[PDB]
Design a protein around this nucleic acid. Structure first.
Length: 288
DNA sequence: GGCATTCATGT
DNA sequence: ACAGAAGCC
């Protein structure tokens, strides 16, 4: 909780914004030695190009500001760090626009944002690992992977960087399997770690997301769900919906993974936010 | 254990 | 759209 840096920065957000939720979300999925989530505090190792360091983000609810502190090694690339924090926290979102379009589904938790990531690859590795297991177990698994293939910081030895596409492509699929996962999944990771290494995996949000996801689902281990939920968190595609999600079929009294594709149409172009509101709004039921 | 979600494939 | 590998009681 002691300033890891001398340089401080401020990012504005447009209320409303449920920070307890956000930080709750990220804390659950917090990978041990990579990131540290607490009450009004989030911290993590960060690689921007060849620059390394620690970032912390402290919300200030009174003045619609997020306070960012950077370690010295991250100063030369401050703007990009801030852009990563902004995509991680959805600071550019216009809640009024989203919520107004979500109509009734927006009402209960209007401060819900779309939790993003800091790195499209990192998000991709996460998307694969958290595939079938519980949110908690993915977290523990991903900590094991990072513990082995992650790079430590020279200035902050209690922090390690999320593993790069390099160390990860050079991974022994069996060493991965030993960290507690199917061969088919260790192989998935390595594939992705290779695509990203050779441009084949888009790091910035593609212009045609549906098209870009087509290409994704042709990856080993990556199907339609894993591809959709990655576009959402990895690219922060805001108009993505998952009709096949287990939790959604449940909230649709006998409805086919095609009938809902037409229901969720009513929430363009904010279907990602709609999806989230459904998950995290218990009281909610379709307008039958 | 036989059965079942649950997401990934392939005809 | 239409039929295999990985907790449930």
């Amino acid at each position: 909780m002691a300033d890891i840096g001398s340089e401080f920065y401020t990012l504005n957000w447009q209320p409303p914004y449920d920070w307890s939720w956000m930080l709750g979300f990220l804390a659950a999925r917090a990978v041990s030695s990579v990131e540290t989530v607490a009450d009004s505090y989030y911290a993590r190792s960060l690689a921007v190009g060849e620059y390394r360091g620690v970032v912390t983000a402290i919300p200030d609810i009174a003045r619609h500001t997020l306070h960012i502190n950077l370690s010295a090694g991250l100063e030369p690339v401050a703007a990009e760090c801030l852009a990563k924090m902004s995509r991680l926290f959805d600071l550019q979102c216009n809640p009024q626009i989203v919520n107004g379009a979500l109509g009734r589904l927006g009402a209960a938790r209007p401060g819900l944002r779309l939790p993003g990531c800091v790195d499209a690859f990192e998000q991709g590795v996460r998307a694969i690992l958290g595939q079938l297991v519980s949110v908690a177990m993915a977290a523990k698994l991903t900590a094991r992977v990072a513990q082995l293939y992650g790079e430590r910081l020279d200035d902050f030895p209690e922090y390690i960087c999320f593993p790069t596409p390099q160390r990860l492509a050079a991974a022994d699929p069996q060493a991965l399997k030993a960290l507690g996962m199917p061969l088919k999944r260790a192989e998935a990771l390595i594939h992705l770690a290779n695509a990203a290494l050779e441009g084949t995996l888009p790091m910035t949000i593609p212009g045609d997301v549906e098209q870009a996801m087509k290409t994704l689902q042709t990856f080993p281990g990556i199907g339609r769900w894993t591809a959709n939920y990655f576009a959402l968190r990895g690219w922060q595609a805001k108009d993505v919906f998952l009709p096949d999600d287990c939790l959604i079929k449940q909230r649709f009294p006998g409805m086919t993974p095609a009938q809902i594709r037409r229901y969720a149409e009513r929430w363009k172009p904010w279907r990602s936010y709609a999806l989230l509101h459904i998950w995290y709004t218990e009281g909610w039921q379709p307008d039958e």
